[PDB]
């Protein structure tokens, strides 16, 4: 009951019904295969009562991490998909539900501070646009830190985590863009939002923090224009 790729150890939602491939010879890139193809298990988020949620930006989260992060910040062009596995370790006495959703071209927004003519420029800071490996917390999860409502987020590729039912979720995301290749540093293709729809609840004498865990595997990566 386990599977291993490249000395890394550890149902499936296939986004838009297409399996990520390589681009053809047209329409000489470097293909690292299992060197950069492995399981990156990033840090663990403690999920609490009264927690709003978290989000990531996927070409961004691995920019500082490991071998994939080396190639990313040095090759000029980038293409790849991802296989993303979100696990939650809880007990039969905890209850709650998580909505794991993959938002293509997820663009964070800023909120105007209540009373003001609101014409001046407001803008999300660089921490919210590129949260890095640590992810970022929703201040307003109901609108997804954008204008779109949460209740319709199910139109994106998603999966439910219901603690009484399965505790794991796996989403495979093909490369989606308007260009065959793009910049890994500047452009963020999508992001995960893990949103506790139904809040977390338990009884006294149990574990308060429930450890949501995120593990992401690049798929069919290819690079171009290697600098120093």
């Amino acid at each position: 009951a386990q599977l291993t790729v490249g000395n890394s150890t550890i149902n499936i939602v296939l986004s838009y019904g297409e399996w990520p491939g390589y681009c053809p010879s047209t329409d000489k890139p470097t293909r690292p295969d299992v060197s950069v193809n492995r399981f990156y298990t990033l840090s663990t988020k403690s999920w609490k009562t009264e927690s709003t949620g978290w989000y990531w930006k996927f070409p961004d989260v691995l920019n500082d991490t490991g071998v994939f992060g080396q190639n990313a910040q040095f090759h000029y062009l980038y293409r790849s998909g991802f296989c993303m596995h979100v696990q939650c370790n809880a007990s039969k006495f905890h209850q709650g539900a998580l909505l794991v959703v993959v938002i293509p071209e997820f663009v964070v927004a800023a909120s105007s501070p209540a009373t003001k003519p609101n014409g001046q420029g407001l803008y999300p800071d660089f921490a919210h646009t590129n949260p890095g490996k640590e992810g970022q917390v929703f201040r307003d999860p109901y609108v997804l830190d954008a204008g779109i409502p949460l209740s319709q987020a199910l139109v994106f590729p998603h999966q439910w985590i219901n603690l009484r039912t399965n505790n794991c979720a796996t989403i495979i995301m093909p490369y989606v863009n308007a260009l065959p290749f793009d910049s890994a540093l500047n452009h963020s293709n999508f992001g995960l939002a893990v949103i506790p729809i139904s809040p977390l609840k338990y009884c006294n004498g149990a574990t308060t923090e429930v450890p949501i865990t995120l593990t992401i595997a690049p798929l069919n990566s290819e690079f171009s224009g290697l600098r120093q």
Binding site: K92, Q95, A97, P149, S151, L163, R164, N204
Partner: protein, 228 residues
């Protein structure tokens, strides 16, 4: 020379006319198409996606708490839990679904809906609810025994986490339609050291035979401010 004669429809600009126009740039060759995953040719494909239905719209509730409905230990028997209309066009819970937003761009719709429920309580909890559908022309059932009569499904928490209810032969054409009530069948049974209050999530979507006609413009976006 074939002498012609002009008709009354001449020199007429009809905004809905599909005509032919000279290209301003001839010989201009636009960028070729690369395969982009996830194209959608129809809105009906977006209607068949189950999206969250906000059944708790009561004035006091704010935030994501609107998207879920409480169940708890009742000191009374056979009480009513929640109720909502089946009409996607009208103002109400269906405004949060993708179907309810996408049918407000059209004048008339017809077809079947399905409404899925999902129980987020703990794995140890058990109980039964009674989910009843009331056809048009009838009022809301007063008591459970009146609802026990036709078009109901009794739903057990232990056995299944989710359950589905199909709504036949819906149409708006005009100028009371449908009601779905959720009744406590038994009581909410719980072991020690586990939460006694849970939540239910309501999803809804169109089915295959659903159709739309006579596209109009939506009233939600009015926004009298001219700065937008």
């Amino acid at each position: 020379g074939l002498p012609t004669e002009l008709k009354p429809g001449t020199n007429q600009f009809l905004t809905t006319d599909d005509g032919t126009s000279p290209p301003i740039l001839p010989g201009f060759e636009p960028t070729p198409l690369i395969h982009i995953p996830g194209e959608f040719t129809s809105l009906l494909d977006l209607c068949r996606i189950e999206t969250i239905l906000e059944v708790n719209n009561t004035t006091g509730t704010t935030g994501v708490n609107r998207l879920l409905i409480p169940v708890r230990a009742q000191n009374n028997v056979d009480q009513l839990c929640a109720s909502f209309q089946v009409d996607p066009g009208r103002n109400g819970p269906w405004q949060s679904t993708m179907v309810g937003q996408i049918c407000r761009y059209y004048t008339q719709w017809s077809g079947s809906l399905k409404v899925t429920f999902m129980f987020t309580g703990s794995f140890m909890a058990t109980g039964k609810m009674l989910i009843a559908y009331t056809p048009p022309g009838s009022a809301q059932p007063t008591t459970r025994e009146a609802a026990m009569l036709g078009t109901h499904i009794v739903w057990d928490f232990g056995l299944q986490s989710s359950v589905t209810l199909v709504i036949p032969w819906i149409s708006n054409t005009h100028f009371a339609t449908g009601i779905v009530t959720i009744w406590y069948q038994t009581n909410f049974v719980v072991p020690p050291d586990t939460p006694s209050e849970a939540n239910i999530i309501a999803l809804g979507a169109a089915q295959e035979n659903f159709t739309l006609k006579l596209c109009k413009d939506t009233d939600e976006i009015r926004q009298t401010a001219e700065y937008q």
